[PDB]
Amino acid sequence: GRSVASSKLWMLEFSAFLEQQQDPDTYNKHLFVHIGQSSPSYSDPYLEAVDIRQIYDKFPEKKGGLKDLFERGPSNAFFLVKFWADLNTNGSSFYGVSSQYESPENMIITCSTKVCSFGKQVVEKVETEYARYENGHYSYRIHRSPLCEYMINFIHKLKHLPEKYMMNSVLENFTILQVVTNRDTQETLLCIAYVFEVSASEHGAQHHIHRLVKE
Amino acid sequence: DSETDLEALFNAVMNPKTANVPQTVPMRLRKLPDSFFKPP
Numbered sequence: 001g002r003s004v005a006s007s008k009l010w011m012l013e014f015s016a017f018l019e020q021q022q023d024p025d026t027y028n029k030h031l032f033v034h035i036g037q038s039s040p041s042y043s044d045p046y047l048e049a050v051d052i053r054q055i056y057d058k059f060p061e062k063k064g065g066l067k068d069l070f071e072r073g074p075s076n077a078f079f080l081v082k083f084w085a086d087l088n089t090n091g092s093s094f095y096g097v098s099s100q101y102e103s104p105e106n107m108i109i110t111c112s113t114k115v116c117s118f119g120k121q122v123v124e125k126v127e128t129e130y131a132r133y134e135n136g137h138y139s140y141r142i143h144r145s146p147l148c149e150y151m152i153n154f155i156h157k158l159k160h161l162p163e164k165y166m167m168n169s170v171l172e173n174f175t176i177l178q179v180v181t182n183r184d185t186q187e188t189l190l191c192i193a194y195v196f197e198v199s200a201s202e203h204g205a206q207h208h209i210h211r212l213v214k215e
Numbered sequence: 216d217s218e219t220d221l222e223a224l225f226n227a228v229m230n231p232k233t234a235n236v237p238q239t240v241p242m243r244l245r246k247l248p249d250s251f252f253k254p255p
């Protein structure tokens with residue numbers, strides 16, 4: 001399906017999942033959210049835009065916050081992803097996040113992922129990634145990064161809510177900000193603001209991508 | 216109080232009479248595209 005790309009970096013894959021080991025040779029994987037999974041990832045200009053001012057309150061403010069990052073640019077690196085998450089799933093559990101990126105440039109990149117409540121940072125995961133040459137480009141992979149305990153707790157609490165509409169009510173004030181940076185130059189390669197609802201679709205998890213624009 | 220309190224977050228929806236979280240404008244009331252609320 002649709003993914004996100006700036007001039008310097010393309011995110012081809014993103015997934016968060018729960019993997020259960022039934023026995024040493026049998027694994028069951030449930031995807032909560034996914035980009036570039038059920039169909040090959042792509043990027044094209046047929047994107048619609050969202051006024052970034054409409055979402056500033058849902059993300060960290062001040063120096064290094066969303067407004068500061070957007071103002072510093074480049075504007076073509078900024079996206080809003082809405083996920084309709086698939087929460088229908090059941091020691092031997094592993095909660096993971098995987099992602100993959102491509103660039104024409106050989107860089108050392110840093111990926112900062114901030115989980116936010118009412119626009120306030122609760123936890124941050126920071127990962128450093130080196131390039132691998134592949135089919136005429138450089139690839140970067142975060143493979144099966146353990147989901148932090150806050151998110152495991154959050155998902156447990158969500159599933160313990162008696163009604164699905166309650167889950168949506170909680171999700172309205174839960175956001176994730178992903179900022180991928182060239183470590184040396186500090187250039188913003190990708191900045192993705194994530195917003196969530198629960199999926200009601202028979203096909204499971206879904207996503208919509210929007211460009212973020214000034215007005 | 217603390218805005219990042221995970222228990223308070225969920226208590227607000229489970230037991231609305233005791234909700235102690237920031238009040239906000241629901242996404243559905245904001246100037247956002249129609250697609251934003253219609254899954255594909």
Ligand SMILES: *C(=O)CCCCCCCCCCCCC
Binds near residue numbers: 016097113124146148
């Ligand atoms: C802890 O390490 C924070 C890093 C967060 C990674 C993003 C995972 C995306 C969460 C999707 C689950 C959906 C729950 C509604």
